[PDB]
Amino acid sequence: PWELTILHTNDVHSRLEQTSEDSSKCVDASRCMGGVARLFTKVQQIRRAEPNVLLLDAGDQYQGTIWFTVYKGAEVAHFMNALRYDAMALGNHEFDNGVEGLIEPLLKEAKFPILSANISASGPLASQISGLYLPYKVLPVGDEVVGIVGYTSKETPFLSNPGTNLVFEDEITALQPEVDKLKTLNVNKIIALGHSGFEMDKLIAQKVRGVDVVVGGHSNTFLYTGNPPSKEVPAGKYPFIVTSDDGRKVPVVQAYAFGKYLGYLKIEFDERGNVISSHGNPILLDSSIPEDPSIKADINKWRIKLDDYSTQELGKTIVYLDGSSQSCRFRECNMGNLICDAMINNNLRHADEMFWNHVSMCILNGGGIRSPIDERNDGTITWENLAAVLPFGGTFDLVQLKGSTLKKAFEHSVHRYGQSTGEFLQVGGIHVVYDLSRKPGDRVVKLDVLCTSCRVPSYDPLKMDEVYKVILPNFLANGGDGFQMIKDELLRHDSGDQDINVVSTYISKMKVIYPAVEGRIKFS
Amino acid sequence: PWELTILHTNDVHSRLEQTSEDSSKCVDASRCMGGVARLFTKVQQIRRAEPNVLLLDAGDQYQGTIWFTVYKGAEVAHFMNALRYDAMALGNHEFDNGVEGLIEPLLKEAKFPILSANISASGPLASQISGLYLPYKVLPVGDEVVGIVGYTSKETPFLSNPGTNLVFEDEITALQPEVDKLKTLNVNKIIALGHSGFEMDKLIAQKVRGVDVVVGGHSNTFLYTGNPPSKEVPAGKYPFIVTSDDGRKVPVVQAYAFGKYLGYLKIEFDERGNVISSHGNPILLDSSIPEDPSIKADINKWRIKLDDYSTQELGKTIVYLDGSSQSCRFRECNMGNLICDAMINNNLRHADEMFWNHVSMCILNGGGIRSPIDERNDGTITWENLAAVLPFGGTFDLVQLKGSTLKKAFEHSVHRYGQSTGEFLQVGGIHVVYDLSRKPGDRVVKLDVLCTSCRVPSYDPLKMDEVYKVILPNFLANGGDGFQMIKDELLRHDSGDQDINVVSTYISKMKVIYPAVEGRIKFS
Numbered sequence A, B: 001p002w003e004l005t006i007l008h009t010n011d012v013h014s015r016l017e018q019t020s021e022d023s024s025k026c027v028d029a030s031r032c033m034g035g036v037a038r039l040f041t042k043v044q045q046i047r048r049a050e051p052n053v054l055l056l057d058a059g060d061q062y063q064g065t066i067w068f069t070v071y072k073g074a075e076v077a078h079f080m081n082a083l084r085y086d087a088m089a090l091g092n093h094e095f096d097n098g099v100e101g102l103i104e105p106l107l108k109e110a111k112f113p114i115l116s117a118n119i120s121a122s123g124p125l126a127s128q129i130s131g132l133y134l135p136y137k138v139l140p141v142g143d144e145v146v147g148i149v150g151y152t153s154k155e156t157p158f159l160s161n162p163g164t165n166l167v168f169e170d171e172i173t174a175l176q177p178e179v180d181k182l183k184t185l186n187v188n189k190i191i192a193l194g195h196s197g198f199e200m201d202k203l204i205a206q207k208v209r210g211v212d213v214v215v216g217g218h219s220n221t222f223l224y225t226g227n228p229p230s231k232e233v234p235a236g237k238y239p240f241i242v243t244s245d246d247g248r249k250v251p252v253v254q255a256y257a258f259g260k261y262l263g264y265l266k267i268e269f270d271e272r273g274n275v276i277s278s279h280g281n282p283i284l285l286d287s288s289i290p291e292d293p294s295i296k297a298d299i300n301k302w303r304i305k306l307d308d309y310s311t312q313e314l315g316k317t318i319v320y321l322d323g324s325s326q327s328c329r330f331r332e333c334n335m336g337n338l339i340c341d342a343m344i345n346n347n348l349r350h351a352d353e354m355f356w357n358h359v360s361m362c363i364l365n366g367g368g369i370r371s372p373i374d375e376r377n378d379g380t381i382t383w384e385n386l387a388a389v390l391p392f393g394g395t396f397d398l399v400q401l402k403g404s405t406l407k408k409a410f411e412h413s414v415h416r417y418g419q420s421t422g423e424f425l426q427v428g429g430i431h432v433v434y435d436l437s438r439k440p441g442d443r444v445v446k447l448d449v450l451c452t453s454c455r456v457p458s459y460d461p462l463k464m465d466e467v468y469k470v471i472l473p474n475f476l477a478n479g480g481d482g483f484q485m486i487k488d489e490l491l492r493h494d495s496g497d498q499d500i501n502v503v504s505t506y507i508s509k510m511k512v513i514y515p516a517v518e519g520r521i522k523f524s
Ligand SMILES: O=[N+]([O-])c1ccc(O)c(O)c1
Pocket: A017, A066, A303, A304, A306, A307, A310, A383, A387
């Protein structure tokens, strides 16, 4: 048998430096984890021991920290080149700075192939990008070859800024003919590497005939065989075994997010490229693995421009930005309005004749707003100032919620009103009226929401059966501050942009801000 | 006696081309008036006949039409140079593009002195601007000399964008020592030329000892001796005679606005520079005076870039901009919200610890909103599109109104609701609730306004005795659409920027707009 070791990352999301256990800023070095210097050590160790190794990334290196804000993907090309990745699939966040922000920093500077079989271009863009990403690439491994066919979420136009030329085809439709082609070219070992989420990964494993293993991403899925090594709870075994339509067992893998784990799968193939066995587990990149000193020193050199950027003026406020808990845990606060307005502006995507924009609504728990910003420093706002307001390194995510779920969330928001608890909601595109004299669970007396399927945005009563798109912190999507109904009842959840970055981009676009308290939240 | 002929303009406000009788676009050439080509003819004729002539401008050539939007003051230097102005005082609107937008296009290119004795600079700006404007200039006229001392509204920081270096001193305080100095230098004929308004002009005539004649502006004041020649109603005789504190009679002149009239004052002086007599009248520049063909041809050449600019994309909308009368004369309309938001953004000026901004409030009659803009031209908005919405060439002005006056205006807004009449008000920084079941004059049941003297903007009930700053069309400041209470009760009124220009600047700043209907106006 011929044994291949697949090492894989996904959804690293700009975690160049080691992180805390919950993938926020590293504070206690002895408990820190991940980062590219530590990954380098582990990858180098495995490549010394195993003959046939591929190191693969399933997309979403872009977006997540000040690294991406400042270096705009140059850090991804540089550090992925240093680790000697063998291939990468395009993720949705690779389009966050448009097609231009993908071509210049990453496609032109990567020393490895970048893959997606289900993205097509037309007009001048087609000529401009031809060959800079590929549907697949056949790689030599020892005296053998392995084909690697890429794919990217069909939902990318709703989840990033790819622009109106690129077309994202159904993944299975696009993949099958490429896998068929590889079989005709005597490539009998085929990895599907791509960025659509665990559910689609299982469908690809089932339906794309000739795929031997699926290496996925997007959904931040943690899979594990045995006792988990940290706080992440497995969604299933590693690998997850799909029974294909052709009758074969097909392993599906993912490795969480944020560079906390290195995926590790060993596959035995027969002479005809059939999988005989597969086994492995993600490896927790904890402090027992030393950071490579060379990579760490290069990281520290690149950090100088981040420190410089962090104290520069992003824009100005002419108003006090009231992020005090005495305001934002009790009533509408203008810092809450600012952040929700920034969230909505970040999620302006291309729209049909069917909607002015696909999403119009925002909620933000007051517990997540951690400081005010004073306007009397000549109005200046810096990244450092925003990091005091939003210190946890989270994202502002897109979810789909029934109106009934959103009504329960607003009842939760005031169920124990008066105690300065975190669950009180700041809003955008929502007007709520509470009557605190009513019983807990029955205090919401008016709830109106901004239409999407309308040419003129206006407010309509929330309907209980309708499904609404909402932008909210990942903390709330995961049931934080007691919002278990959001976690348990949401229909769809896709990870968004970094919290500080969303607000910084809005302030830099606006140049001078003046958010008011305007009646989004009222009391009877 | 030595006779001087003073020819003077003020508040021309970018009316390079001839205009209609009400200083909007020229449609019927036989009834058009003003413009620089016609002014050239008249000035040339007078200079052939009179030996001792000065042609003076009292400021506010900047701001008023697409000429200023495109050429940014280059048109002012070019055409004032062609007419051979002898001197100009700085007006408030000369600061609309900051100090940089005054220095480069106008102070560096004018072939005549530009004057203001009550503006001082500090730090590097003082060195940068030294001598580019002057407190006064002594001009040869025949075998005599005439001193001309300039002044500019002390309120300019509230009415333009001069920036935080320049200091605007009290006019009389700054003028007297310069007039004293000129007397010590044997200059016995002194004109005060400046831009503070008729009321301040009369105070200067009264209190600045040694001023022989005041040539003013800013207030668009029409003065006339006899039967007026057009629709403007005189505020007093031409000249207006002030009795000075030194006992002398001092003539005060102004010549309306928009280049419709050329001021013409003949002054007889004795050997000691005392005024013996003065007489004259503004000359209506009607179609009986031919346009100079050379100047007209140069105007037509400069117009090519205006035609090109007018169809360029300013920015995008992702929403239908509902400027229909069926919406904007009956309920809150999103075109009204856009225009009022643009009005407030245009009036963001430098602020103390006493206010986030000096003005927070806007009203706009639905009768002034003349078209929608459809978003399905790839979202594009052009100047031509905005000119369909705002076709009358007006301004968005700053007024001070008691709360009682503003309550009467909102009662007027709905006094005959249901007939599609123009007086229904769109708003910014105001939330109104009507109950149409109540008697006319008693239909406003809630009226809340955005604070100014606050670090966090929020809404408070309107108080009847408080004086509020409001941004509104000149049409309403002048009592249009039946708003006689505004005209008769306002405390202060200063002319603002051109209506289309205000909206175009906002759209270009924002890049992508999405105004909603949000509850600024509600009905019980
Ligand atoms: O936000 N900052 O200022 C940062 C963040 C990460 C860094 O490594 C840094 O050197 C500065």
